[PDB]
Amino acid sequence: QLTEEQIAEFKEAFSLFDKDGDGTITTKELGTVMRSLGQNPTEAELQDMINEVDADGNGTIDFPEFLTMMARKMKDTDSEEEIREAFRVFDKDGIGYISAAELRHVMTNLGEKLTDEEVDEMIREADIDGDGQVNYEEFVQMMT
């Protein structure tokens, strides 16, 4: 079952990538977000990533395609597993922690409309022991 609220949440995730609001995610829009986070996929790789979600093969992801993928992922994952996978996405180097500076960068770029003050309070709350890193334990409490 997919609630109205859940669909709206998935639309917010879709719209993060669909920055021109034209109802499709292109390779260019995917590349813009990935480059902003420090990755540099080739155009071929971006095309292959789009193709993992682009069910009708027209070269872009629309919201029915996005929703199919996101709803299936949610049904297939548990609250504990999805937080660990997300941590590993953001712990790109797999070091066991995300530095405060790295987390600030992720939050400003993915939050889009967050002020530096809001990101400040988020980082301060997340970094429980104040050592300038968010480890897995602190990430789980932040995300729970």
């Binding site: 949440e9 979600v53 997300a86 992720v106």
Partner: peptide, 25 residues
Amino acid sequence: VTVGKFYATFLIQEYFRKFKKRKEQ
């Protein structure tokens, strides 16, 4: 990798939502 990156974005956005809702209270 692809699905996980999209789902990770959703999960951090959910964290943003809950943070804002508590700040507004």
